[PDB]
Design a protein around this nucleic acid. Structure first.
Lengths: 144, 57, 134, 184
RNA sequence: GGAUAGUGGCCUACCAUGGUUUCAACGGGUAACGGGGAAUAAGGGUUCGAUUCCGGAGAGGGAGCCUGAGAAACGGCUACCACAUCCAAGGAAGGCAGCAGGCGCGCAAAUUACCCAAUCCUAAUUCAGGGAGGUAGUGACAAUAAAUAACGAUACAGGGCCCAUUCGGGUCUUGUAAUUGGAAUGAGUACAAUGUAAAUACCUUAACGAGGAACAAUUGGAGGGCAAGUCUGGUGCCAGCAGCC
């Protein structure tokens, strides 16, 4: 029995059955459809420039209690509105508004990382000035 | 509770202490030599389970 | 120096270019390096032909010193060397004069100039005179 | 247009990183054989892994198989040429059995220490990298050597450095100038 | 039958109504040039392959054509379309997806350099030309090797062995050190030769070039997976950490 045929001339049946089950698989689907290119904000790119517009004070999911100090961003090549977790302490004050920041993902491939709901992306630079560098004063942001 | 302020709180409020001076440590193969002569011929901490960073006990 | 002992290796006569060619090693301890003119006079007296006739090129020093290895090449005479060898080899030996030229970009610029000009130029000169008269 | 230069590494990182036994073993090896780099250790392990895959997929084959004969004899020939293998153990199971310790003791630095020109493997290291050594009649400044035993017969200090003469030293002449001024 | 260099609906005249299809035709999509191959593996395999090599296509999009053995040529013409320039406003000249270089696009990518010295190609031809190509500059894309420190003696603490003459020597140890001393070359300066078309680098060696304040190795992390603090201060579900818990 077992389901799956066994004849020596049924490889067509096997491939097409497998094709349907690969459509049921996860990464085959979004890869062959180009969700990353047609619906995702980045366009399947590792990073992306962006312009912050305003600030947001998303509270943390349970079981936890904080406010995560994220921001609202628009891209340039696309023009889509994105939220982004300003990672470290004081960095929001570093990245107040109008800044041509750089964004990337979290490390979970299109999902939110921790107790930070609605956010998949974060900031890594400010007009070519790194946020860890700003945080540790190894470099400093052009004021104007 | 309106906490969309206070960013940088503890990093500003922290009492600034600075790194004391000490000699430059061995580098490379010298470091691996230090690790060997600390871990094996120095029998300094083998009590039951070989700690490496003994807190003051 | 102290016992250069310039020694040739894999010698072979090529009568077609009318020369003889080999790969040569010098052993210099207590010694920075040999010089090309020194090597050429040494090979000229060991192979009896002439200083401007014998030639050399290469001579990489083996690591740590103590020896170098290069290519030495004697010709049947000075005239044979002068007719067969490249101008760069003759001028670095000092046997000839390296004709001076400008930048390749400047040669190409003047080439484009006389390519945009057609004919000798005397007629165009007289015409430009008669035109720039007023 | 220029046909591209082949490049390929000579090491491979561990599959699973943090195993205290593995870490302590390779630390043992580095601190006894005078090494700087787990990179180097992985490199030696990679050579051993290469020969071990070769040994396995050759001894899998029957006897008097000319492939087995040719490849096993060439492996034997280079292993005897380097001395990692003996001159009387050619049965291929010792090749299955051989050690990173065997490769390391056939290296140059600890060889120098056994020959006694060092007083410590780290002293051997600094002599190698400061070029106070030569295995033939040409100086070498690389620890990782895989000696061919003619070097072993031919070890001496650097001729173009003291302990084999021909110069007293840079800082030797420096001290001599110091004492000349002091006497003056 | 015309045309072709040639077969042939390649095209025309007349005639027959056929040809492909669930063994996925035809239409749509493709961040699709194909391949030699690349990453990755016990086996089976999955993913990628613009990109140095082979065969194709194109020169801003299309169409046409002269010369020629060979082009549907674009560093050759003709027109149109969209671009764009010089005008003493009548007119004229162009196609960097060639090498450099610039704007814009962006996460994302080098000098408006030197040489035909080689490797080859072209011509009537050894001799000339060649951003094909080679050299150097930028360059932490990736790969190889490999500095940042070592060594003797002086103050502690050991292990075999001799005396077993007590806990005295410890001959020799191997580390701990606000101990001290030497020698030891490298990075960088090199006089120079060598290097190369000319060089600049590599290798060579003069002369000058360390005692740590010297010539100063960072990047991650310490509750588990996952190796590494029940240390100190600050903070007090706030700020923040964390790929998962």
């Amino acid at each position: 029995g077992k389901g799956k045929p066994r004849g020596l001339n049924s490889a067509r049946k096997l491939r097409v059955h497998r094709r349907n089950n690969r459509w049921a698989e996860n990464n085959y689907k979004k890869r062959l459809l180009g969700t990353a290119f047609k619906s995702s904000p980045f366009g399947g790119s590792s990073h992306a420039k962006g312009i912050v517009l305003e600030k947001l004070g998303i509270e943390s999911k349970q079981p936890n209690s904080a406010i995560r100090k994220c921001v609202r961003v628009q891209l340039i090549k696309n023009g889509k509105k994105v939220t982004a977790f300003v990672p470290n302490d004081g960095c929001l004050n570093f990245v107040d508004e109008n800044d041509e920041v750089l964004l990337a993902g979290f490390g979970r491939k299109g999902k939110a990382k921790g107790d930070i709901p609605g956010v998949r992306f974060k900031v890594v630079k400010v007009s070519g000035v790194s946020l860890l560098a700003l945080w540790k004063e190894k470099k400093e942001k052009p004021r104007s | 509770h309106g906490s969309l302020a206070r960013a940088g709180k503890v990093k500003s409020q922290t009492p600034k202490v600075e790194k004391t001076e000490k000699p430059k440590k061995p580098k490379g193969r010298a470091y691996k030599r230090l690790l060997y002569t600390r871990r094996f011929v120095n029998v300094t901490l083998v009590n039951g389970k070989r700690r490496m960073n003994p807190g003051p006990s | 120096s102290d016992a250069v002992t310039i020694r040739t290796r894999k010698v072979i006569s090529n009568p077609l270019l009318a020369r003889k060619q080999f790969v040569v090693d010098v052993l210099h301890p207590n010694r920075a390096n040999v010089s090309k003119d020194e090597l050429r006079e040494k090979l000229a007296e060991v192979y009896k032909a002439e200083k401007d006739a014998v030639s050399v090129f290469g001579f990489r020093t083996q690591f740590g010193g103590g020896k170098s290895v290069g290519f030495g090449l004697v010709y049947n005479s000075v005239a044979e060397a002068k007719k067969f060898e490249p101008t760069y080899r003759l001028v670095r030996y000092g046997l000839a004069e390296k004709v001076e030229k400008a930048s390749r970009q400047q040669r190409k610029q003047k080439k484009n100039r006389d390519k945009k000009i057609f004919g000798t130029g005397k007629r165009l000169a007289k015409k430009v005179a008669r035109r720039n008269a007023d | 247009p220029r046909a591209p230069r082949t490049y390929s590494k000579t090491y491979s990182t561990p599959k699973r990183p943090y195993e205290s036994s593995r870490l302590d073993a390779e630390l043992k090896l580095a601190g006894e054989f005078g090494l700087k780099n787990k990179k180097e250790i992985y490199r030696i392990s990679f050579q051993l892994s290469k020969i071990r895959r070769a040994a396995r997929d050759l001894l899998t084959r029957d006897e008097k198989d000319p492939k087995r004969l040719f490849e096993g004899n060439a492996l034997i020939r280079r292993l005897v040429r380097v001395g990692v293998l003996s001159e009387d153990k050619k049965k291929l199971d010792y090749v299955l059995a051989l050690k990173v310790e065997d490769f390391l003791e056939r290296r140059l630095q600890t060889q120098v220490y056994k020959l006694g020109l060092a007083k410590s493997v780290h002293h051997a290291r600094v002599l190698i990298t400061q070029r106070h050594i030569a295995v033939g009649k040409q100086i070498v400044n690389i620890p990782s050597f895989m000696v061919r035993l003619d070097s072993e017969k031919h070890i001496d200090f650097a001729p173009t450095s003291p302990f084999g003469g021909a110069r007293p030293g840079r800082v030797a002449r420096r001290n001599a100038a110091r004492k000349a001024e002091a006497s003056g």
